[PDB]
Amino acid sequence: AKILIAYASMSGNTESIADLIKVSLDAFDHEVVLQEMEGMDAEELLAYDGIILGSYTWGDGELPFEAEDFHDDLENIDLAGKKVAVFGSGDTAYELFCEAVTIFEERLVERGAELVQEGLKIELAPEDEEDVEKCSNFAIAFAEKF
Ligand SMILES: Cc1cc2nc3c(=O)[nH]c(=O)nc-3n(C[C@H](O)[C@H](O)[C@H](O)COP(=O)(O)O)c2cc1C
């Protein structure tokens, strides 16, 4: 086991970002598991060397209902030594664009994880050239940390 991508997606935008990151991480002969974070016991993260969380942002910059349980679930695990990163899909029409990226970044650092880079912030779906290149650069820099 190596790198885990746990994502929360409702309309598919964050899921599409998770798919792009995994494919890049595949090209480096890493072991990349792709999972949804809902109903996922947070204990599973300790089997991995790297962990990449991903979530969309819901009302008033709050985590979606599905991700707050997993976020609170992280309260009781030591992530010391785990190299982590965060991504998310939001909409700049809101004041708190991709607050979920900041929320999960603080929580992972709050539990001893080594945050290797600033989170990836995509608007809506990664359905154009520079969004795909944003994901491609983010995933490669994470692989350079390994
Ligand atoms: C009711 C509602 C509230 C939202 N609030 C925010 C927000 O506070 N900040 C933000 O960046 N995006 C917000 N969004 C936009 C979603 O984060 C955006 O549509 C995202 O791409 C959905 O990702 P998904 O396809 O993985 O579900 C909101 C969307 C809805 C419908």
Ligand SMILES: [Ca+2]
């Ligand atoms: Ca986009």
Ligand SMILES: [Ca+2]
């Ligand atoms: Ca663009």
